[PDB]
Design a protein around this ligand. Structure first.
Ligand code: CYC
Ligand code: CYC
Ligand code: CYC
Ligand code: CYC
Ligand code: CYC
Ligand code: CYC
Ligand code: CYC
Ligand code: CYC
Ligand code: CYC
Ligand code: CYC
Ligand code: CYC
Ligand code: CYC
Ligand code: CYC
Ligand code: CYC
Lengths: 74, 48, 172, 274, 162, 162, 172, 172, 172
């Protein structure tokens, strides 16, 4: 389950679980048609280390998806 | 130049045959120094 | 991914058993009707563009709000997304039809789809309708094609319908 | 002397040689000073096996430096066939994986990320594969995990220079050759002040990476096709980078892990500052 | 689960593409082949009982020492778990026959095989010898394309174990 | 070049795997299907001349205005390049028939189609109408599975152009 | 990638022509012999492990230097690499055999291979020999299998040999 | 340089062995068919000019672009180079045919040839075709000559073909 | 070509300077030890043949694969090439030893050598070993000669070793 297992190999310090409403920031299907992503990837839970927290958020917003939540990972 | 060059070339021809004797003139440092790779052979005996 | 045979196998295994003579002959029948099935899948592939186009023309004929400003199939970008989704769904319905099982449709296309559309503000009832129109035309083609041998394809037309109806139900 | 035909006459193994000559072997017959042609700065010649020892001795004496020896027949079979990789097959990992869907991904990430070297079964990253299977991480996530691993560190980083590492990195992670001298430099300076790990992240969180691979697509070759903001000479670098289907990244070469892209070649695409 | 049908669908999907004549030709192969496959399946299904007892015994006859005390072919539980295991293999062979591909074998027996066998001190040699024997007897239950099918899958298991 | 044979080989290679019963079943489909395919191919091959002239004309009959001066169905060179282009399509249809897949069509006509047609002011509608006509006449040159094959590929081109 | 049909098509296209009645019937014959071809590919797949193993046993029987320290099939890591390459080459030979064309073998396997081995210090003559042994055993299996219908497979055995011989020549 | 015997010898030596009774009789057979071989080589020598000429006429009949300005067999200088290459390749094919081994062809002619042509801008596919035409005509002559004793030369015609086919493959 | 003085001069010139009193006395010391140096070079010259022979006997004692068929010091031609290379390297090591600088060794002998051997298939590790054996025996001779005045030659024995070690490192 994206119910993070362990530290999810992030190492680092704290783990924040951040969910975003990703658009085709990521996951455009390789298909010929219009840069969609599966329907069930509307919200994308993801666990990142404290050191990598800021960079990721900057490139999420930059590519247009908007953060929906944020909780410390544990 | 001398009767030694003839004896060396005659002995090489007898030991290694015709093709090795032709290569001995062309791979000589005298050929390389004065014709190089891109100059056609030409008569030289009129210049010291 | 499952097909109709694979489904049989999974249920047999959950009993710890070799396939029942019951299940064997159900699958022998699927092989029996497989030429018809290939024609049915071929009917959709061979008219995919028109099936989408004709569904589309008719969807916007009915729901002229979608193509007004404020509407979810306006401007060109959104219309292209809507046309693309019509194709995606028709595509997974044809896959299910080759397979004899809905799973590829449910797992790769329908799972999460409704919640995507709601997040986006895409009117699901309109999307359901576009799927109903694709069904009408697709089946039209399954039933009236180029020099196919005459026979009865109603079993397959039903099954295709349930795949269209699954998608509609799942989305509305 | 340049690019050759044939191998042998009586029989030989022709080797083609390459050097850098003084005006001692080759000069013009001009009135002053001895010079060789500027474009034959490094010259190459194909010599059959017996004349070979004698030639190398001569060249070294009169001043030249041998840059290479390689059999002629190796060098006659062209440049790689690229049909398999002009346009590849994409592999992407779906939301509810199927049990062997996920098997497909792992084998491919391995081949692509590790550059076709063998990863033996003792070697594989099993705990990490566990994670992908359960969906805790995604295909891009997993791809980052292999890069920071020792196996990746060990065959590609520890034993070669930074120039080489970065050049491999572009090939593996991004599928394309390195476009500029600036790219090499920009990266080397990062490793130097933020460490190895920060530097690894920089290809996997990049905008270029994100567009093409998104997040569920295994990185695949894409440099044999025209891309954006790619200098033109980066399509010839790709041939230098990938040597064919049976070629691989290999750190086990007799000569070791070395380059493949000439430093001179990179500068042709532009030189600035920083 | 790998079948001709799932494979062509997977390949279409991954290029965002409707099934075309290439993919439907492929499917026809799988459907044309079903008769031979399913004959093999029915024969392997009804002979299962004896095919299993035949192969189990052959493991002991080829590895006599297994049946001595302190060994892994001794006592009711080892010999019981053996019959079961060969029965699992024959079961998945019939499934692979019926399914039109190696999927059932790949997903339920091949994935993980070596790790399991290595932790439990199970030698592949036994299992190869069970299968070699099953292959000998299936020579006279089937013939023609049903035999070729049975063989294809038995051999597939033997290669998985080597 | 996409054929049933190349597809299964591609799928094996990419998993580092020998061809197995799944892949060989697929290949049998392609080989079993060759007879119908190749009958379609021979009929389309010998009628090529007239199929092309029939479709060329039909483009002008359906788009009358094309043949007026200042237009793209006027003068020897336009009308010549048209016949040629339909001939290219029929040629690749026969190739796709013979090859056992859409490869020849995908590689030589589909890849790049729209960019080319858009730069040169060529309307797909003409080409669809050429193909619709060719489809009408091929109704009486073939029947049964050869007709289905011919149709499969003609329709494939029409969808590529919509 | 090419197969025997695709090859025909490429040559026809370079003439600007529909396939010659010459080429048509050459391909009709390939379809004629295709059941035999499937058995031949199946012969290799069904004995891949033994073909590699038996080739291997014999390679090191002949060349006991490879398994000494200093030798290119020593220690375990190198032997596993050598066993792996034997499998890779046998694989692409079987692909060529299904295809009726060597191209997949030449393009994905043989292209650059010799220069790889020389860079590595891998003795190419030994690799060539390992390929010759795989050929002997593989063809053995193509010729003497389980209850296949009796007939003449020599044409296919030749063609398989040329694929083994291509690889050998390319590498030595 | 190798011939068919020399090849045997090199393989034997790599085993550290006197020639196998296997290899001995393979070579006894080559001596058995050697009169036919001499006629086959003689067929090519005796018609070399026509073989090149006829191949040529036909190459430019097919590919009228080569003899236009811009084309690689224009002006006279280039046509003479192309005619010369046709002769060179036919020559090394005849040498291979006397030898019973392709090595002289591969080592002295084919090695590097493709990369030469690409450097020059010489269209390799056209060169491959010119080689295919030489093959057709050359074999024609091998099969239908002046008062040679009647018998079966198909083995030799095949072998000659593979030398023509090696060259074609190597160049295209 | 450089010797130990010439090296000093090049470094001085790159400063734009007359030689430093530092560098002067380093060179005065080289002149101080020059009789010993001459004996050391003479030790090698006077036993060149045995040094090569003894190294050789021992190399093939250790690596009996090189003298089997398949091995890089088989047949006579290859053994003569290997014996010749042993002499060439011993020769340039003696030149470096007269010179007090490695440059002649690096520039005329070691430069490109590894890549030559790899191109040839010559096992570089075996060549490195042959160099290590020459070193052992050569130094043996430098240390225990015919009626040379007794003293300490360890500085020179080290320096000779580094030339042997340069060559080994460069080649392996
Ligand atoms: C797994 C296969 C798959 C499906 C099914 C899929 C659906 C899907 N439809 C989307 C958007 C969309 N879908 C539509 C569809 C419609 N608009 C209407 O008004 C009509 C009722 C309807 C057409 C019948 C529109 C307009 C958008 C764009 C919404 C926006 O960005 O405002 C998006 C957001 C990403 C994107 O715009 O590319 C997804 C993921 N994506 C997938 O990967
Ligand atoms: C075309 C084939 C051919 C022949 C025949 C030939 C003969 C020949 N013999 C020569 C020398 C010689 N020939 C001899 C032969 C002899 N001395 C004696 O006392 C005996 C009576 C006799 C041996 C039976 C000697 C001793 C020399 C060397 C003379 C010198 O340099 O002082 C030389 C001078 C070049 C050289 O020394 O290599 C030639 C050209 N050269 C050739 O290329
Ligand atoms: C290239 C992949 C492929 C296809 C597409 C394929 C089609 C195919 N359809 C067939 C029959 C047929 N197909 C149909 C289909 C229909 N009948 C109707 O009236 C409906 C309009 C339509 C409903 C789908 C019928 C009724 C038959 C004859 C009965 C049968 O064979 O089952 C047959 C048996 C031969 C014949 O009777 O013509 C083949 C081979 N075979 C293939 O290998
Ligand atoms: C085809 C006609 C042709 C050209 C153009 C040519 C250039 C040329 N210049 C050379 C060297 C050289 N060229 C220079 C030139 C300069 N040094 C400076 O600092 C200045 C910036 C510049 C003078 C303006 C120098 C100093 C060398 C010697 C480099 C060395 O040996 O260290 C050499 C190496 C061979 C030699 O030294 O003779 C070539 C081939 N050779 C040719 O055959
Ligand atoms: C951070 C270190 C770490 C842990 C601890 C971990 C646990 C873990 N166990 C998993 C599956 C699993 N774990 C088990 C374990 C068991 N089954 C049983 O019946 C027993 C009670 C038990 C063994 C004692 C099984 C059977 C699965 C597979 C479930 C399935 O796919 O159906 C998965 C899903 C991904 C996968 O299958 O690889 C994760 C992430 N993953 C990790 O990365
Ligand atoms: C494997 C470990 C490693 C080393 C050793 C390394 C060397 C190295 N030095 C570089 C540049 C450089 N190196 C220097 C060094 C100097 N400039 C001078 O004038 C002095 C003589 C000298 C300092 C003592 C300079 C100035 C550059 C920048 C050149 C330029 O961009 O113009 C570059 C190009 C990339 C970059 O600029 O970051 C590399 C790869 N890189 C590595 O990864
Ligand atoms: C495209 C398909 C493909 C092929 C064919 C391939 C060949 C190949 N063989 C390799 C190594 C190897 N290959 C061998 C093979 C042998 N050793 C012997 O002594 C025998 C003569 C022979 C076995 C018959 C060995 C020992 C190595 C390891 C060399 C080393 O690291 O020292 C490597 C270096 C990467 C690695 O070790 O994984 C490649 C790329 N790679 C590919 O991707
Ligand atoms: C779904 C497919 C599937 C397979 C194939 C399978 C194999 C399998 N065999 C097992 C044990 C076993 N397997 C055997 C096998 C044998 N003993 C003998 O007398 C013979 C030598 C041999 C039969 C040829 C034995 C003795 C054990 C008990 C091992 C132990 O727990 O010590 C176990 C350990 C769990 C258990 O104790 O049952 C597995 C998972 N499990 C599966 O789920
Ligand atoms: C290998 C497959 C292939 C296809 C399909 C192809 C199409 C194609 N059609 C072209 C032109 C053309 N195509 C047509 C087509 C037509 N004119 C009419 O009378 C009708 C309306 C219509 C036929 C239905 C015309 C008039 C041109 C000339 C366009 C121009 O250059 O202005 C061109 C531009 C190069 C040229 O001028 O020849 C291409 C590439 N080329 C290919 O290589
Ligand atoms: C699952 C993929 C697949 C396979 C493997 C397949 C095999 C297959 N092989 C066949 C025939 C055959 N196969 C062979 C093969 C051989 N004869 C010999 O003596 C040699 C030992 C061997 C050489 C390869 C022969 C001789 C025939 C009969 C002649 C023919 O049908 O061409 C036939 C025709 C029916 C029959 O006569 O049995 C089939 C269906 N069909 C398939 O769909
Ligand atoms: C060992 C025996 C041998 C061979 C085989 C050989 C081939 C050969 N062909 C050459 C050129 C050539 N070869 C051709 C041949 C062709 N042009 C075409 O368009 C056709 C496809 C083809 C004729 C069938 C042409 C046109 C050139 C001149 C290329 C140029 O200079 O632009 C050259 C460059 C040197 C020269 O032009 O004389 C070599 C070395 N040389 C040899 O010594
Ligand atoms: C000067 C060099 C030289 C040549 C050329 C040579 C030829 C030669 N060809 C011969 C036979 C022959 N040659 C052929 C050749 C052919 N049969 C055909 O139908 C084909 C058209 C042609 C294929 C190449 C045949 C069939 C025989 C009789 C069988 C045999 O002796 O092997 C014979 C045996 C005597 C005879 O039966 O006439 C000789 C001596 N001997 C020589 O010393
Ligand atoms: C600049 C001074 C100089 C050096 C150092 C030199 C090395 C050299 N060694 C060569 C060959 C060789 N070198 C060896 C040496 C060895 N074989 C073994 O197995 C041992 C490990 C080793 C002896 C210790 C052998 C066997 C060959 C012949 C390789 C062949 O032709 O197959 C060749 C190829 C040309 C020839 O065979 O004459 C060169 C250029 N040439 C030079 O001009
Ligand atoms: C023809 C060229 C030439 C040579 C060879 C030469 C040798 C030479 N070696 C000498 C000394 C010597 N040579 C050595 C050498 C050694 N001592 C040992 O115990 C070691 C075994 C060996 C190490 C290399 C020693 C220790 C001395 C006495 C100290 C000295 O003069 O430096 C001396 C000084 C006179 C004497 O004490 O005998 C000369 C002239 N002179 C020359 O002109």
């Amino acid at each position: 389950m994206s119910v993070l297992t362990g530290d999810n190999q992030q190492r680092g310090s704290k783990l924040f679980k951040i969910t975003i409403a990703l658009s085709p920031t990521l996951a455009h299907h390789p298909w010929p048609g219009l840069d969609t992503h599966e329907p069930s990837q509307s919200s994308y839970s993801t666990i990142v280390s404290l050191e990598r927290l800021l960079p990721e958020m900057t490139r999420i917003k930059r590519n247009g998806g908007r953060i929906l939540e944020i909780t410390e990972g544990e | 130049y001398n009767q030694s060059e003839f004896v060396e070339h005659l002995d090489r021809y007898q030991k290694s045959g015709y093709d090795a004797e032709i290569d001995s003139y062309i791979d000589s440092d005298e050929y390389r120094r004065v014709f190089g790779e891109n100059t056609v052979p030409y008569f030289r005996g009129f210049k010291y | 991914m499952q097909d109709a045979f694979t489904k049989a196998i999974v249920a047999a295994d959950l009993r710890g058993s070799f396939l029942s003579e019951q299940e064997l002959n159900q699958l022998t029948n699927l092989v029996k009707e497989s030429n018809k099935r290939l024609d049915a899948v071929n009917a959709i592939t061979g008219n995919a563009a028109e099936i989408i186009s004709d569904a589309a023309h008719k969807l916007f004929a009915e729901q002229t709000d979608l193509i007004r400003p404020g509407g979810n199939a306006y401007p060109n970008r959104r219309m292209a997304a809507c046309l693309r989704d019509m194709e995606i769904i028709l595509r997974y319905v044809s896959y299910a039809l080759l397979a004899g099982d809905a799973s590829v449709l449910e797992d790769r296309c329908l799972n999460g789809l409704k919640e995507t559309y709601v997040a986006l503000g895409t009117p699901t009832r309109s999307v359901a309708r576009a799927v109903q129109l694709m069904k009408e035309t697709a089946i039209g083609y399954v039933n009236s094609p180029s020099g196919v041998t005459r026979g009865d394809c109603s079993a397959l037309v039903n099954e295709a319908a349930t795949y269209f109806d699954k998608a509609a139900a799942s989305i509305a | 002397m340049n690019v050759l035909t044939t191998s042998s006459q009586r029989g030989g193994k022709l080797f083609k040689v390459t050097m850098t000559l003084s005006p001692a072997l080759s000069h013009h017959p001009w009135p002053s000073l001895d010079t060789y042609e500027p474009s034959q700065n490094s010259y190459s010649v194909v010599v059959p096996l017996d004349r070979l020892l004698a030639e190398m001795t001569y060249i070294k004496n009169k001043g030249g430096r041998v840059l290479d020896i390689s059999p002629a027949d190796l060098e006659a079979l062209g440049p790689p066939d690229i049909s398999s990789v002009a346009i590849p097959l994409k592999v992407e990992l779906w939301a509810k994986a199927d049990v062997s869907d996920v098997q497909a991904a792992i084998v491919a990430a391995y081949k692509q990320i590790f550059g076709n070297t063998y990863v033996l079964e003792s070697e594989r990253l099993t705990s990490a594969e566990s994670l992908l299977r359960n969906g805790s991480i995604s295909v891009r996530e997993f791809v980052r995990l292999l890069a920071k691993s020792e196996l990746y560190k060990e065959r590609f980083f520890f034993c070669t220079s930074n120039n080489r590492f970065t050049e491999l990195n572009f090939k593996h992670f991004l599928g394309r050759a390195p476009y500029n001298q600036s790219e090499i430099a920009a990266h080397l300076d990062r490793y130097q002040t933020f460490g190895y790990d920060a530097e690894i992240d920089s290809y996997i969180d990049s905008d270029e990476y994100i567009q093409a691979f998104g997040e569920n697509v295994v990185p695949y070759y894409r440099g044999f096709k025209s891309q954006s903001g790619q200098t033109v000479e980066s399509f010839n670098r790709m041939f230098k980078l990938y040597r064919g289907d049976a070629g691989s990244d290999t750190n086990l070469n007799l000569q070791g892990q070395k380059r493949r892209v000439d430093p001179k070649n990179l500068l042709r695409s532009g030189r600035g500052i920083v | 689960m790998k079948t001709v049908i799932t494979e062509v669908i997977a390949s279409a999907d991954s290029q965002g593409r409707f099934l075309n004549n290439t993919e439907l030709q492929a499917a026809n192969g799988r459907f044309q082949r079903a008769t031979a496959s399913m004959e093999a399946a029915r024969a392997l299904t009804s002979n299962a009982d004896s095919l299993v007892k035949g192969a189990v015994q052959e493991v002991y006859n080829k590895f006599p020492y297994l049946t001595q005390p302190g060994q892994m072919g001794y006592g009711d539980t080892n010999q019981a778990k053996c019959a079961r295991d060969i029965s699992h293999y024959l079961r998945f062979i019939t499934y692979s026959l019926v399914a039109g591909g190696t999927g059932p074998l790949d997903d339920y027996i091949v994935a993980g095989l070596r790790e399991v066998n290595r932790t439990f001190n199970l030698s592949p040699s036994w299992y190869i010898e069970a299968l070699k024997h099953i292959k000998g007897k299936v020579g006279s239950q089937l013939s023609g394309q049903p035999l070729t099918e049975a063989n294809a899958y038995i051999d597939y298991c033997i290669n998985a174990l080597s």
